[PDB]
């Protein structure tokens, strides 16, 4: 890095350095701590969605096992590096079959993002794993399990990283506020959690954007309005009004309301559709085909939007689909 | 295999067939007697049916089974036959014949030949199976037609599924290289379309003709491009426009006057060629494009040989301009 850590992005500035700074994975953290505290550390397969803390967890585990000079005693290979059949055959085999250099210890290999590896390399790694197990251990981090061969999966103990719970995100937010001397309104916190979807990177990015948006962070408190302005996401009140107008009001006034709501803050149609879907998922419908039509038509509209096209036609289609689906209620 | 093509007519071809169950009965009984294990003759044929003409494989089977089991009778023949079944990938013709059979798609057949089995059959040769299915799905007598459904409706549904499978295949071989969709292409190209017209073939199975048509179309496009870039300096149009609109008018000037004035139209044809930088090979290519009732093969053949010889001599007796240099 350059200068100091204050110039780093919040996503990288607040990267955990030890295992006790990882939140939302109490079971996995306790299990790995117990494993590394009594010498029985098996091969690990950390499977989870982005932003859960798998890389941070493995880095902290390596630091605890080896210490400050852990970078020179582990072999970290990721998608950014070339990992082919020849690499597995030569470099990984040599690392697993050779003693340590700086200090006595066992060999650790971290194959981050191994789901992007070829099948030949995965097949080759089987005997490398099963032959040098006495002095070497393997850790594989993945987001999609279908990319891993069954043979590789059989040789690794599986640990699943769940989406971050609400309390963990609140604790991390409180720590960040304490470090940055910032104040957050409770409604702003709830909106941040709602839009976070269990990813801490989104929390940090949105919080940094909100801090940058404030006129003076020293004596300004971030509110839900600030978060909505920074992210441009529709407000819940706007979504409720749009849904109400679509459901009860006629075509002309519903179209006018949708246009006015979208043009007031430059809202995007996809976010409105997502919010309407979330709101309607809790509706106690009396018929099934109505829900079927809603889901199918909204998925079609989302797919069409993903490829671009006329936005006004897409909004009219959304309104018409909702009206037609709710017509079946009778 | 195509690699054997050079050996087509340079060696005496000797073909060996799978030995019958009666040509090896005596040898196998002698082996059983010598090795002191009982081998019931009545179950011998199944062994060959299990090994499918492989004497070495059946000998190895006997050697392995006799290690701990000294009796080979009908009580355990089924187990060994099931355990030692040989799996060989079917050829494209065999794949098409089996996939277009209505027995496997019935309620009873489906429990024996499952969907996974059909997908594996497709995967035995995934580069030919869709073509064979698309070629041979119009020559069947379906036996799985739904009550009230006609053959034409099933054919239309199969064609729609084939089009969807073609779209999937195009997406598979794109820059993204989405090969994980190959199993889906198995259903949309081979299994599903065959499931609607499954039955008995109405005739011999024909190999796909799409490859030859594609090669011919590529050659025709190459000749059309050559002609278009040879006449680019004179015409204001593209190759598609040249083929659709210009070629009939050109025929009206480069072929018609040979059929009326005889050998006196050579000068005009040569003048047209010079004006449009056309050559004799370009003439042949252009006259070969026409289809329908405007075929020129018979007309060209009926032209007197003297006229053609004079035209060739005139063309070769003078200099002509060249449009593109070092083509």
């Amino acid at each position: 890095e350059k200068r100091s850590k204050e110039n780093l992005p919040w996503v990288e500035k607040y990267r955990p350095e030890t295992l006790d700074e990882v939140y939302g994975q109490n079971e996995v953290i306790t299990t790995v701590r117990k494993f590394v505290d009594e010498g029985k550390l098996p091969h690990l397969l950390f499977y989870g969605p982005p932003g859960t803390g798998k890389t941070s967890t493995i880095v902290a585990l390596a630091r605890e096992i080896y210490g400050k000079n852990y970078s020179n005693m582990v072999l970290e290979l990721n998608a950014s590096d070339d990992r082919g059949i020849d690499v597995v055959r030569n470099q990984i085999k040599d690392f697993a079959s050779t003693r340590q250099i700086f200090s006595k210890g066992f060999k650790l290999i971290i194959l981050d993002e191994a789901d992007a590896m070829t099948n030949a390399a995965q097949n080759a790694l089987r005997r490398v794993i099963e032959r040098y197990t006495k002095n070497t251990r393997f850790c594989v981090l993945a987001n999609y399990a279908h990319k891993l061969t069954p043979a590789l999966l059989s040789r690794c103990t599986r640990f699943r990283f769940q989406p971050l719970p609400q309390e963990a995100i609140e604790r991390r937010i409180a720590n960040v506020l304490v470090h940055e001397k910032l104040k957050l309104s409770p409604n702003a916190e709830k909106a941040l959690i709602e839009l976070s979807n269990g990813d801490m990177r989104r929390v940090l990015n949105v919080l940094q954007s909100c801090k940058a948006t404030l006129d003076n962070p020293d004596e300004d408190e971030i509110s839900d309005d600030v978060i909505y302005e920074c992210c441009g996401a529709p407000r819940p009140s706007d979504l409720k009004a749009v849904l109400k107008s679509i459901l009860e009001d006629d075509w002309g006034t519903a179209h006018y309301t949708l246009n006015k709501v979208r043009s007031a803050k430059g809202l995007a149609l996809i976010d409105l559709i997502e919010g309407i879907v979330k709101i309607l998922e809790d509706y106690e419908l009396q018929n099934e085909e109505t829900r079927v039509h809603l889901l199918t038509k909204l998925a079609d509209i989302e797919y069409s939007i993903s490829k671009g096209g006329n936005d006004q036609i897409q909004g009219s289609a959304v309104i018409g689909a909702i009206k037609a689906s709710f017509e079946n209620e009778t | 295999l195509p690699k054997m093509r050079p050996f087509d007519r340079v060696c005496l071809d000797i073909q060996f067939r799978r030995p019958d169950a009666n040509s090896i009965k005596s040898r196998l009984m002698t082996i059983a007697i010598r090795e002191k294990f009982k081998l019931d003759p009545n179950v011998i044929d199944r062994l060959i049916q299990t090994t499918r003409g492989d004497i070495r494989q059946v000998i190895n089977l006997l050697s392995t089974i006799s290690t701990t089991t000294k009796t080979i009778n009908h009580e355990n023949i089924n187990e060994i036959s099931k355990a030692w079944e040989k799996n060989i990938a079917l050829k494209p013709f065999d794949i098409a014949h089996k996939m277009l059979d209505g027995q496997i798609y019935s309620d009873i057949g489906s429990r024996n030949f499952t969907l996974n089995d059909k997908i594996a059959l497709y995967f035995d040769d995934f580069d030919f199976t869709p073509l064979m299915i698309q070629e041979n799905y119009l020559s069947t007598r379906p036996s799985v037609l739904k009550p009230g459904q006609s053959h034409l409706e099933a054919v239309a549904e199969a064609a729609n599924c084939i089009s969807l499978g073609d779209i999937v295949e195009k997406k598979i071989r794109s820059s993204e290289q989405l090969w994980s969709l190959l199993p889906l292409h198995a259903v949309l190209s081979s299994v599903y379309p065959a499931s609607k017209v499954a039955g008995h073939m109405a005739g011999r199975i024909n190999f796909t003709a799409w490859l030859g048509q594609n090669s011919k179309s590529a050659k025709y496009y190459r000749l059309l491009q050559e002609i278009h870039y040879h006449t680019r300096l004179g015409t204001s149009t593209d190759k598609i426009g040249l083929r659709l609109d210009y070629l009939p008018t050109f025929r009206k000037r480069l072929l018609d006057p040979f059929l009326k004035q005889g050998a006196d139209a050579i000068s005009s044809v040569i003048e047209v060629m010079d004006d449009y930088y056309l050559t004799k090979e370009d003439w042949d290519s252009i006259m070969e494009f026409f289809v329908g009732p405007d075929v020129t093969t018979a007309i060209i053949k009926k032209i007197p040989a003297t006229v053609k010889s004079g035209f060739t001599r005139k063309y070769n007796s003078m200099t002509h301009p060249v449009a593109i240099y070092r083509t």
């Binding site: 890095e1 350059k2 204050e6 110039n7 780093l8 992005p9 919040w10 996503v11 990288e12 969605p49 982005p50 890389t55 990721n78 998608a79 950014s80 590096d81 070339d82 981050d112 993002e113 992007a116 987001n143 990813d199 990177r201 989104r202 990015n205 940094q208 954007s209 940058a212 948006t213 920074c230 992210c231 441009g232 006629d250 075509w251 002309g252 179209h255 043009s263 430059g266 995007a268 038509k297 069409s304 993903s306 490829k307 671009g308 096209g309 006329n310 936005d311 006004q312 036609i313 897409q314 009219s316 289609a317 309104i319 018409g320 689909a321 009206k323 037609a324 017509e327 | 820059s175 993204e176």
Partner: protein
């Protein structure tokens, strides 16, 4: 200069010329004094000012001297395969920052990192994209990444999570009129009231198209040499907008319901060269905004128009799609 198109001549040079993207421009300006610029993912509709915004930010951050040595820009016109990403991008990111000169350190903030701008990132393959996940994280302290795309769904989830998302809003008459008016005054273009608003409405969130239309109208007025103010009819003619009379005839033929007459009228209409997308948009506006139709008719026509637009967006024949849409509407 005078030898450049108005779209390029009036391209923003600094961050203060951005009109309707304040929600992100304010954050970018604050990053100048905060010096903690994160990885950015600029997404939005075409012609919103993303590349211009990033260029202005890089200029204001580094200076014309350090721009070349601190910026690495890769777009769809360069090979960006997995090997290129793994070698060239990795090497540039892992390099040390160029040493600023006292002049630059005096007149510019000179942040202690370099910027890699991956424009048109939506065209990169998933395998190539996956190679940057650790590259951005490992060298975040010396390098920052800017990914510009039009379709946010084309970016893999890990990269979107790593990057801070910035959505560029559409430029309509309510937020981009000031820039168009300023350009008109700078070029001394005389227009009637509502002409600029009509241009922006026709553009539908594309300021580049509006500027091009204004330039074409100014050229036509100058060639005319009459001094009269530019009207809206000429602007509509230059924008390929179907005349209202033709639309009235189209809807009357649709109401007639006869297949042969509709087919003949469509055959005659397609010889004028009108774009199918404009016709569909005008028909949608007329039918949706009309109060002479019931709920069911609008419910069906909305889906019909959506399907027609989706099919047309895939690059199909306009004649067949237009005829099918008109026939379907006539049977509603």
């Amino acid at each position: 200069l005078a030898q450049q198109p108005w779209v390029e001549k009036y391209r923003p040079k600094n961050l203060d010329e951005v009109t309707a993207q304040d929600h992100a421009v304010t954050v970018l300006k604050k990053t100048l004094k905060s010096a903690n610029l994160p990885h950015m993912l600029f997404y939005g509709p075409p012609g919103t000012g993303k590349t211009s915004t990033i260029l202005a930010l890089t200029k204001e951050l580094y200076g014309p001297d350090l721009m070349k040595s601190r910026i690495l820009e890769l777009n769809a016109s360069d090979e960006r395969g997995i090997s290129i990403v793994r070698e060239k991008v990795k090497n540039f990111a892992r390099l040390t920052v160029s040493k600023p000169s006292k002049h630059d350190l005096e007149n510019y903030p000179c942040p202690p990192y370099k910027i890699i701008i991956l424009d048109e990132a939506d065209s990169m393959t998933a395998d190539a994209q996956s190679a940057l996940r650790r590259t951005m994280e490992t060298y975040s302290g010396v390098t920052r990444f800017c990914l510009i795309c039009n379709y946010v769904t084309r970016i893999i989830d890990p990269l979107a999570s790593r990057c801070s998302k910035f959505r560029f809003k559409a430029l309509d008459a309510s937020n981009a009129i000031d820039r168009l008016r300023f350009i008109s005054e700078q070029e001394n273009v005389k227009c009637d009231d509502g002409v600029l608003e009509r241009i922006l409405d026709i553009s539908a969130g594309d300021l580049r198209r509006g500027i091009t239309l204004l330039q074409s109208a100014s050229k036509g007025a100058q060639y005319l040499g009459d001094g009269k103010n530019i009207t809206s009819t000429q602007v509509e003619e230059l924008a390929g907008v179907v005349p209202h009379d033709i639309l009235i005839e189209i809807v009357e033929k649709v109401k007639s319901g006869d297949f042969d007459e509709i087919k003949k009228y469509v055959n005659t209409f397609m010889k004028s060269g009108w774009s199918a997308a404009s016709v569909v948009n005008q028909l949608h506006e007329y039918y949706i905004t009309n109060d002479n139709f019931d709920t069911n008719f609008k419910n069906q026509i909305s889906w019909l128009l959506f399907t027609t637009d989706s099919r047309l967006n895939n690059g199909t024949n306009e004649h067949i799609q237009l005829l099918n849409l008109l026939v379907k509407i006539s049977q509603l």
